[PDB]
Amino acid sequence: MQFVNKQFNYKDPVNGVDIAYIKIPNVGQMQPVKAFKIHNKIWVIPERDTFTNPEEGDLNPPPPVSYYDSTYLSTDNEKDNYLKGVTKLFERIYSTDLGRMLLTSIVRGIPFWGGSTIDTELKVIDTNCINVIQPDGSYRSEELNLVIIGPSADIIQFECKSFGHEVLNLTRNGYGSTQYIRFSPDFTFGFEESLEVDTNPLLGAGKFATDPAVTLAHELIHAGHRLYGIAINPNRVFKVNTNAYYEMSGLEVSFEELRTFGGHDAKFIDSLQENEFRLYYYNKFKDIASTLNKAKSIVGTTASLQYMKNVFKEKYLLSEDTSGKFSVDKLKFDKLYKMLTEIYTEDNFVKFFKVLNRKTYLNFDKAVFKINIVPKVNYTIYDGFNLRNTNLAANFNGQNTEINNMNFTKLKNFTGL
Numbered sequence: 364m365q366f367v368n369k370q371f372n373y374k375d376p377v378n379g380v381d382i383a384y385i386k387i388p389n390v391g392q393m394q395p396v397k398a399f400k401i402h403n404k405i406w407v408i409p410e411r412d413t414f415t416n417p418e419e420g421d422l423n424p425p426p427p428v429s430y431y432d433s434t435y436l437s438t439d440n441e442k443d444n445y446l447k448g449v450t451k452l453f454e455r456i457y458s459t460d461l462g463r464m465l466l467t468s469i470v471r472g473i474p475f476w477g478g479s480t481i482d483t484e485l486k487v488i489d490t491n492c493i494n495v496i497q498p499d500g501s502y503r504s505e506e507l508n509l510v511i512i513g514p515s516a517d518i519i520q521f522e523c524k525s526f527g528h529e530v531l532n533l534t535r536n537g538y539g540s541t542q543y544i545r546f547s548p549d550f551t552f553g554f555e556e557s558l559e560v561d562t563n564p565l566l567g568a569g570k571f572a573t574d575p576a577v578t579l580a581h582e583l584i585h586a587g588h589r590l591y592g593i594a595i596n597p598n599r600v601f602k603v604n605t606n607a608y609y610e611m612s613g614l615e616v617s618f619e620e621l622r623t624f625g626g627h628d629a630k631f632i633d634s635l636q637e638n639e640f641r642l643y644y645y646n647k648f649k650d651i652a653s654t655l656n657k658a659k660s661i662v663g664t665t666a667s668l669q670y671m672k673n674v675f676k677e678k679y680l681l682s683e684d685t686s687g688k689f690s691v692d693k694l695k696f697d698k699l700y701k702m703l704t705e706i707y708t709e710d711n712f713v714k715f716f717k718v719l720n721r722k723t724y725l726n727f728d729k730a731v732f733k734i735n736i737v738p739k740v741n742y743t744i745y746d747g748f749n750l751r752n753t754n755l756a757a758n759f760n761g762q763n764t765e766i767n768n769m770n771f772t773k774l775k776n777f778t779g780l
C-alpha cells in the first residue's frame with residue numbers, strides 16, 4: 364500500500380476534512396493557511412514558516428552559510444510542486460522497511476495528554492492541536508503529530524521544532540508534542556565523495572547531491588525523538604575535537620544531531636553520558652505511568668478515559684497488572700528507546716536507499732542546488748535520482764551533478780566562506 368492514498372493538487376477545493384484552511388493555536392494573529400492532511404496525524408502546509416516563531420516573520424534577506432530567497436514558495440505552482448514533492452518523499456521513505464517502521468512509530472507517538480493541573484484527570488495540551496476551519500466556517504480542534512512546513516527566511520535551516528510550554532519540557536520529559544518540520548523538497552546540498560575533502564572547509568565544490576529523502580528522514584528521526592519526549596537537550600554538545608577545522612572555529616555539535624546521524628558519529632556520545640540519558644528518560648516514562656494510574660476521568664468528548672489510557676499504554680509499551688495499574692518494564696523501555704535512537708538513523712536510511720551520502724555529520728557543506736523531483740523523468744519513489752535502466756542507474760550517476768547536470772542548478776557555493 365501507499366502512505367499517501369490521495370494525490371493532492373494544491374488547487375483542489377477545501378473540504379474541511381483533509382484539505383482545509385487551518386490556524387495554529389496561540390498564533391491567533393495569523394490568517395488561515397491552506398493545509399493538506401496526507402496521512403492520519405500528518406499535515407503539510409505549503410507555506411514559508413512565518414508562524415511558529417513570532418521573531419521570524421520576515422522572509423526578506425538582510426543586507427554565513429545561509430541561503431535567502433524571499434520569493435520562494437509564494438505562488439500556487441510552487442505550492443503545488445512543494446506538496447507533490449513532499450508526498451513523493453514520504454512514499455520513498457515508506458517504500459523501505461526502515462521508513463515504514465519510523466513512520467508507524469511517528470503515527471503512534473501521540474503527544475501525551477498532560478495539560479491538566481489536576482492529577483485526577485487527563486487533558487489535551489492545546490498546542491498539540493491545529494484549528495481546522497469546517498465547511499460551516501466554525502473551528503474544530505484536531506490533535507496531530509507532525510506538520511511539514513516550508514522554511515522560514517533562511518532556506519537552508521531545516522529543523523524540527525515545536526511549541527513550548529510554560530512548565531513542561533515536552534520534547535524531553537517523555538510527553539512529546541506536535542512537531543513542525545521546516546523543510547523543502549525544492550533544494551538540496553552538495554557534498555564531496557572523498558572523506559578528507561568533505562570534512563575540509565576549503566576543498567570541493569559539491570559534486571554529488573544529497574538525496575532529499577535522506578534529509579526528510581533525518582528530520583523525521585528528530586521528530587520521532589521529540590514525539591516520544593526523549594530528545595537530548597540541545598545544550599548538551601560535543602565540543603568537536605576530532606576535526607582541526609571544527610576546533611579552530613570552536614564548532615559545537617549537539618548530541619541530538621550525532622544520535623540522529625548514527626554510525627560512527629553516535630560513538631562521540633560517551634557511554635557514561637548515554638547511560639545517564641537512558642536512565643533520565645526511563646524515569647520520565649515511569650512518571651507518565653504514574654500519571655495515568657492517578658487519572659480518574661478525562662476532559663473532552665473526543666475519547667473515553669479508558670480509550671486514552673490504552674492509547675498511551677500502546678505508545679510507551681507499558682505493562683498492566685491484574686489490577687489495571689500501568690508500569691514501565693525496563694526490557695521494553697530499552698527496546699523502544701533503542702529503536703527510536705539507534706535503529707532510526709540517517710546512516711541506516713542511506714543503507715536502505717542505496718544512495719551516496721555524507722559519511723559524517725561532522726563535515727562542511729559545499730553548495731546549495733535547486734532541484735525538481737516532481738517529474739518521474741527526474742526522480743522516482745523507488746530510485747531517487749539514480750533511475751534504473753538509464754545512464755543514471757550505476758555509480759550514483761543520478762546524484763552526480765556533473766553527469767546529471769540538467770537536474771541541478773547551483774545557487775550558492777559555501778566553500779571558502
Ligand SMILES: CCCCCNC(=O)C[C@H](CC(=O)NO)c1ccc(Cl)cc1Cl
Pocket residue numbers: 428429430518519520521522523550551552578581582585620728731732
Ligand atoms: C536548502 C538546501 C538543503 C539544506 C539542508 N539543511 C539541513 O540539512 C539542516 C541542517 C540542520 C539539522 O541537522 N537539522 O536537523 C543544517 C542546517 C544548516 C547547515 Cl549550514 C548545515 C546543516 Cl547539516
Ligand SMILES: [Zn+2]
Pocket residue numbers: 581585620623
Ligand atoms: Zn538534524
